[PDB]
Amino acid sequence: VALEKSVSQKVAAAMPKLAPAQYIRYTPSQQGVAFNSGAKQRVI
Amino acid sequence: QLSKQYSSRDLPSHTKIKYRQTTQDAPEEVRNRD
Amino acid sequence: MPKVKRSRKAPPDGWELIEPTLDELDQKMREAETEPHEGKRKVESLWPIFRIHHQKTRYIFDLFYKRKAISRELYEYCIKEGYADKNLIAKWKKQGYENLCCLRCIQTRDTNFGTNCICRVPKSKLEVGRIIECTHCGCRGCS
Amino acid sequence: NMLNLLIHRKNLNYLHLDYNFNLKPVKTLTTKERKKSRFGNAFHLCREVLRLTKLVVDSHVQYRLGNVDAFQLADGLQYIFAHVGQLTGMYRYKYKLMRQIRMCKDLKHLIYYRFNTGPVGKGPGCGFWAAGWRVWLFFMRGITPLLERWLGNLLARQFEGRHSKGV
Amino acid sequence: GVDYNAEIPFEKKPALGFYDTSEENYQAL
Amino acid sequence: PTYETMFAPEFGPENPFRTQQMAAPRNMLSGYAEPAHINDFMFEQQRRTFATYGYALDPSLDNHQVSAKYIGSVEEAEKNQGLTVFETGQKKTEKRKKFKENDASNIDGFLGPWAKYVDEKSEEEQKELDEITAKRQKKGK
Amino acid sequence: MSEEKLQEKARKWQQLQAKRYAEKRKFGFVDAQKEDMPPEHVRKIIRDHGDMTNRKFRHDKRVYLGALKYMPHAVLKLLENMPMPWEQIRDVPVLYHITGAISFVNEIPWVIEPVYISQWGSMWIMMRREKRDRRHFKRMRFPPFDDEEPPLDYADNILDVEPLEAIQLELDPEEDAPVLDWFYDHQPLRDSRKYVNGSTYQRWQFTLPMMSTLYRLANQLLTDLVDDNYFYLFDLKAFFTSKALNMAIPGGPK
Amino acid sequence: PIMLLSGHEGEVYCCKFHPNGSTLASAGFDRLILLWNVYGDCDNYATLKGHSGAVMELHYNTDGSMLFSASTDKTVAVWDSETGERVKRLKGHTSFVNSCYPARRGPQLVCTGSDDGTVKLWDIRKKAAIQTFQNTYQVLAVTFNDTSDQIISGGIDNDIKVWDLRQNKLTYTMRGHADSVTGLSLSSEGSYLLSNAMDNTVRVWDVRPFAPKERCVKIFQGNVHNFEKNLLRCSWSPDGSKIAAGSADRFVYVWDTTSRRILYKLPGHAGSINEVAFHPDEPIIISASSDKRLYMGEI
Amino acid sequence: DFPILCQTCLGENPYIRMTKEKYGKECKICARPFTVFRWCPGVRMRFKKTEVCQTCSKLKNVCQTCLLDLEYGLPIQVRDAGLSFKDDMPKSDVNKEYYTQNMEREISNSDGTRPVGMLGKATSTSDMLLKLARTTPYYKRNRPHICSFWVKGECKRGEECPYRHEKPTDPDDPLADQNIKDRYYGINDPVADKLLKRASTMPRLDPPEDKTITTLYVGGLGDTITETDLRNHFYQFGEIRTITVVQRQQCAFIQFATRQAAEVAAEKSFNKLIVNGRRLNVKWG
Ligand SMILES: O=P(O)(O)O[C@H]1[C@H](OP(=O)(O)O)[C@@H](OP(=O)(O)O)[C@H](OP(=O)(O)O)[C@@H](OP(=O)(O)O)[C@H]1OP(=O)(O)O
Ligand SMILES: [Zn+2]
Ligand SMILES: [Zn+2]
Ligand SMILES: [Zn+2]
Ligand SMILES: [Zn+2]
Ligand SMILES: [Zn+2]
Ligand SMILES: [Zn+2]
């Protein structure tokens, strides 16, 4: 299975469409309560 | 960093794999044979 | 001289009275194609076209649907001769869309994120009075 | 525009492409210039296919301008497709094309014979292209993928670089 | 051109092993 | 895997060894990041709400391990009661007019949604900038 | 909690639910179609960029160049949609990159077989008559324009001007009436739920009168052999045999 | 093992376990109802098709032959669990049906609530509403007592209401939520009713002929609601010893019905959790969330 | 996937829409193509986009767009003046290419979250830079560029103009020139030098008015505090000699075995120490 995935990427060249909207939740490392509006996280 | 260059040779050919058949001499026969 | 009408039939009975304004709008369109591209930026180079097109189609749309001064014969003649726009008029019959600019502004795909351009968004929501010009169209607040 | 951009992209300022797609040189070339300026078959094939279409389209354009006539235009179109080998030069770069050329010559014999049967003489005016037109389309159906692959590589070398390795 | 006389072409700082190389520096010519 | 086992606090001393930043859980240097599957529509509601008025309910998971709190400037939030952009505002104010002719019968005349806000058609500054420009020019010399 | 606050809460909830579960946002929504644009848009883009030598344009120069790869594709679609000699003006659908780099003709020339044949049979007749009758049939000169002559803006010359009569033919009002009203239109019976499938323009179905009229129109291009006996050893089977045995049948292929 | 299920293209809002513990039912925003094998390889068989709105709530009847489905298209469907054929459409409410319950034991009954502010009693054999209780605020969650005499409704008024089928009066009001109630559920004994609410409070209320008169029997904590404003549902364990309620913080919370200690806080979900269900025989939890995946936790 | 960012770039909104291109741009340092991220930071903001590839950030530990350290928000020249210059990295051409390659494998083999060798060093800090580190987000940095039609007096977009209408910066100021490569390597960085000049004036470490004096003249005591606060703060240092206390002017004198310890207590203390939630200020004599 792993090899096949790899092969398909290589083969992408020979055969010249992506539609995902994907959300992520982020914790910063700066924090401090004045860095964001005041959220331990953000969403992107 | 994979180039968009191509070549004639590279293109698909013989995408199917000819498996041996039973009368051609499949491994099944071989294992059993003396 | 004219659009060099395709149909070769004679236009319908109602033509003579809507002739002039179509003549003048199309003259305006030709002027708009000609005028050139100095400090005009670029995305602003296409605007007058969309605007005039909206004008023409709004005209025939008004005459047929509102004032009722045209027979379907003449209406569809002005559609199939390409004076007016089919799709756009098909929007303006909808509930919400009645002032629409373009069929670009409501195409979802054409944005980065698949959303209709701020072109659409009602003024009440922006709530700043901030000033807006649709980079496609040249709208400011369709709705 | 494409072909001029290619030419400029490589700084070949001593070449000149005219509007019927004849690539000429401005001046007598220096040895070094001659090396650098050669185009391969990909570019020339493209150029000649474009030339063919320019012949066609121009013919229609003169009809629309009222310089020609319907019947004359039809005859011109038949001429064009039957005479590609002597108007273009496509073959130079691909010799296989001769296969289409021969077809067109034969069909012109065939049709011209039947057409000019009675009172009608050996004169110039026979329109009846449909046949010749077919032939070039079949050609194009196949050659398209070839040119996509070859021009693809040409562009890729131009932008990515000749992959320098002795590979 | 400056891959030589400006900036040490490619640098491998020696790996550091059980002893103190912090202090060491060397004299000019 | 029970609550007792999974969530038992890590034992005893904390080593100052790590910088405020070093002490934080991480996946990718700058912080910890992971998938989420939030209903797109709600995202739009929160994003516009914040963008327009400054107050949007915060997304967090472990802020207190339970959450009671808005995350906006909040002047609007108390006053506006979390008005959603999609939901109609309780009150309306301060419309600004743009001249329009919509018949299209007229030529040149016609403005559609192309209507140029009637209202909107420093000298003091007009000088500082100029000076700066001059200086820049001189520097090019 | 107060009545006022409850009412308020309810209101907001209503609007939230209405939007979150709105039909358009419905799971597998697929929204709209790429509605086509005013033709002047593409006209002006190319006219602006006519030589991408303008200092302003810059970035198109890279983009335009890139397209070259699909130019032959474009050519094939152009050529296969030529207008035929009985049409004055054929309009075609076009996809042009928003940049003006490339225009493709997005269309396949489908025709109703017996109609098509008939029409070129008509042209056979006409062309033959024209050649007979003109004293001197002057033929065009190739290239029709000079190299140093730049390509024409359609809009500046062509657009304004008349189309000048096509070849046509004088069909009898009486005998050829079935066929006669739509014979020389572009895609004859596209708008008719009686004769063709529809705007996909597949599957035609006519009456026998139509068929007989078309047949008669087509006669000059048509074989008069009703049996299969003519082609005895001139068929494909014979040719195959002939090939394999390295023989030729007197007037067949070697 | 844990077992991870996937297939729903959109958010999963509800999931249930068949009364006999042989299969699962799940549905959400996609509009498909999927059936799953609880054992074997956890295979998926029939897909129920026919809902045009999203599926807001599933239930099985006590026999496990009938599956009820409240949709946002204002229709409550009755499904045959065996074949997957649709039985009836309860067309009636003027707005979205937020939730539905089927009376156990007694002759077939169904209760619904919707955004029109009403609660309706349905006899599946009549194709018409039997009784209507106009509230005034949109209704989110509704359940019957074991005697099939009373209707328990949770809305956005922070007040759980109890309705008498014979008198047709507001019999009971429960105060103790500070915000909207999103999910209600009776104990298997009839003894206790479980509620979730925006205020992040899980509250158990006891309903009895003879009542203390301030039935805030117990309060639990941990469960967080947020800007998604998803409906949140809670469930009783088969024996009434454990309480599970989903949250928006990616954790499944399970509490001890007595001591109120958090037994489990479980991760694995990426987004908000919409419903948690207990297998009727064995300590197995099905957790459904907006991340479109289900887990089969075993305790 | 996902960039590495300052909290100051990313935005002051918690909700953010951020787009991604597979190989968008070359990085202006190691000069390779890399995934690029755009997003809008805020209402009047500029659409920032990552300027350098993720690797050479992990290498010098910095935001992708700003190139300011993650923890300190300081230009690299600064935090190197603050600890360790000897990190280095070849500037020169094909070396740069080579060293980047290898270090890219080394990073590939790390736990992933760690700026390579620097982090072994990066923990020990606070000398100065903490005190010169910036505290709050600085949004003036994302404002749109200065409209360059208007700065010639002409701009014909009127109020619509998204650019900014105001006086630019006089090209005289050495703080103008600011190359990117330059800011990255820590060469002659005007900003960094300015911050260095600011570092020096910090009244702090020279001390030593008199020999052997361990006397500490402590101002801003306050009458909430006890001595025991003092001792249980100061036993870390060593053997106290004694402590003199005055609560009438709220000044506390202190004395240690060695002057070294007194210098220390200054250092550790000065404009840093606070106990009893009240600032404890220190001076010599
Ligand atoms: O009679 P026309 O209408 O003028 O046709 C002529 C002619 O045909 P015939 O001589 O058979 O009447 C040529 O025949 P040859 O002079 O070569 O015997 C033929 O030449 P090909 O045999 O090569 O077809 C020539 O074409 P071309 O002038 O290119 O040779 C073609 O007229 P077109 O040039 O009008 O085809
Ligand atoms: Zn518009
Ligand atoms: Zn718009
Ligand atoms: Zn608009
Ligand atoms: Zn780099
Ligand atoms: Zn940055
Ligand atoms: Zn400006």
- Cα-flanking dihedrals φ and ψ of residue I127, to 5°? -45, -65
Protein residue with its CA nearest to atom 6 in ligand 1: D122
Tokens encoding D81: 């497709």
Residues whose CB falls within 8 Å of the CB of residue H174, separated by 6 or more in sequence, listed in order: H159, H160, H161, H162, H205, H215
Give the Cβ contact number of residue G236 at 10 Å.
8
Q: What is the DSSP letter of C7?
A: S
Count structural domains, chain C: 1
Q: Are I213 and I260 in contact, with CB atoms under 8 Å apart?
A: no
Query: Which subunits have 3 or more CB–CB pairs within 8 Å of chain F?
Result: A, C, G, H, I
CA distances from I260 to I128, I212, I242, I265, I280 (A): 19, 9, 15, 9, 20
- List the one residue out of H269, G140, G118 whose CA is nearest residue D83: G140
Decide: H232 and H222 in contact? Cβ < 8 Å. no
Query: Residue C110 belongs to what domain range?
Result: 1-143
Distance CA H144, CA I109 (A): 60
- Shortest CA distance to H159 belongs to which of H174, H146, H172, H145? H174
Among D38, I140, D125, residue whose Cα is nearest residue G132: D125
Nearest-by-Cβ selection for I7 from A28, A43, A44: A28
- Residue I146, classed as helix, strand or coil, is strand
Residues with CB under 6 A from ligand 1: D 112, 122-124
G9 touches chain H (CB under 8 A): yes
Helix (H, G, I), strand (E, B) or coil at C48: helix
Whether residues G40 and C53 touch (CB distance < 8 A) is answered with: yes
User: Which residue, judged by its Cα, is nearest atom 7 of ligand 1?
Assistant: D122
Q: Where are the alpha helices (DSSP H) in chain I?
A: 7-10, 54-60, 76-82, 93-108, 116-122, 129-132, 180-185, 190-201, 227-234, 259-269
Q: Using the beta-carbon criterion (under 8 Å), do A34 and I135 form an inter-chain contact? A: yes
Question: Which residues in chain A are contacts of I10 at CB distance < 8 A?
Answer: 28, 42
Is the distance from CB of G106 to CB of D92 less than 8 angstroms?
no
Residues 6+ apart with CB under 8 A from G5: none
Identify whether the C-beta of residue D73 lies closer than 8 Å to the C-beta of residue G140.
Answer: yes
CB atoms within 10 A of CB G186: 16
Contacts of H250 (CB under 8 A, 6+ apart): F61, H267, H269, H270, H271, H272, H273, H289
Index of the ligand 1 atom closest to the CA of residue D109: 24
Residue G250 is which amino acid? Answer: P
Nearest-atom number in ligand 1 for the CA of D83 is: 29
Pairing of β G103-105 and β G94-96: antiparallel
Pick among 3.30.70.330, 1.10.287.4070, 3.40.50.300, 3.30.2320.20: CATH of I215-284? 3.30.70.330
> Which residues numbered 13-72 in G keep a CB inside 8 Å of some CB on D?
51-52, 61, 64-72
Contact H138 G14 (CB under 8 A): yes
How far is I282 from I216, CA to CA, in rounded Å? 7
3-state secondary structure (DSSP) of residue F43: helix
- DSSP per residue, chain H: ---EEE--SS-EEEEEE-TTSSEEEEEETT--EEEEESSTT--EEEEE---SS-EEEEEE-TTSSEEEEEETTSEEEEEETTT--EEEEEE--SS-EEEEEE-SSSSS-EEEEETTSEEEEE-TTTSSEEEEEE-SS-EEEEEE-TTS-EEEEEESSS-EEEEETTT-SEEEEE---SS-EEEEEE-TTSSEEEEEETTS-EEEEE--SS--SS---EEE------TT-----EEE-TTSSEEEE--SSS-EEEEETTT--EEEEE---SS-EEEEEE-SSSSEEEEEETTSEEEEEE-
Length of chain H: 299
Q: Please return the burial class of I259, using the count of CB atoms within 10 Å of its CB with bins 0-12, 13-18 and 19+.
A: middle
- State both tokens at G129: 């008559």
- The token duo for C113 is 């994120």
Cβ contacts of G126 on chain D, cutoff 8 Å: 71
Q: Do H227 and F58 touch (CB under 8 A)?
A: yes
- The full set of domains in chain H, from first to last, is 1-299 (2.130.10.10)
The resolution in angstroms reads 6.5
Residue closest by Cα to atom 27 of ligand 1 = D83
Query: CA-CA distance, D39 to C73, in Å (whole number)?
Result: 58
- Around Cβ H141, how many Cβ atoms within 10 Å? 28
d(CA H231, CA H248): 10
Helix, strand, coil shares, percent, chain D, to 5: 65, 5, 30
Judge contact between H157 and H177, C-beta under 8 A.
no
G-chain residues within 8 Å CB-CB of F81? Answer: 8, 12
**Cβ neighbours of residue G54 under 8 Å, at least 6 residues apart?**
none
Q: How far is it, in rounded angstroms, from Cα C91 to Cα C106?
A: 10
Longest dimension (CA), chain G: 108
Cα I17 from Cα I47, distance rounded (Å) = 11
What is the rounded CA–CA span in Å between residue C46 and residue C52?
11
Query: Which residues from chain F sit within 8 angstroms of residue H263, using beta carbons?
Result: 2-3
Strands H192-197 and A23-27: unpaired
Per DSSP, chain F holds a count of helices (H) and strands (E) of: 4, 1
Rounded distance from Cα C48 to ligand 4 centre (Å): 13
- How big is chain B by its Cα radius of gyration, in Å? 19
Contacting F with CB below 8 Å, chain H residues are: 11, 29, 200, 221-230, 249-251, 254, 261-266, 270-272, 289-292, 299
- From the CB of residue E9, how many other CB atoms can be counted at a distance below 10 Å? 17
Contacts of H56 (CB under 8 A, 6+ apart): H13, H14, H70, H71, H72, H96, H97, H98, H99, H231
Q: Please report the DSSP string for chain G in residue order.
A: --HHHHHHHHHHHHHHHHHHT-STT-TT----------HHHHHHHHHHTSSTT-TTTTHHHHHHHHHGGGHHHHHHHHHTT---TT-S-----EEE-TTSS-EEE-------HHHHHHHHHHHHHHHHHHHHH-SS-----SSSS-TTSPPPPTTTTTTTS-----------TTTTHHHHTTTTSSSTTSS-TTTB--TT---B---HHHHHHHHHHGGGG-----SS-SSSTTSHHHHHHHHHHT---TTS--
Q: Determine the residue type at I169.
A: T
Helix then strand then coil, in percent of chain E rounded to 5, is: 15, 0, 85
- Where chain E is broken, by preceding residue (C–N > 2.5 Å)? none
Give the pair of three-digit tokens for residue H180: 């909207």
Q: How far is A1 from chain I (nearest CA, A)?
A: 23
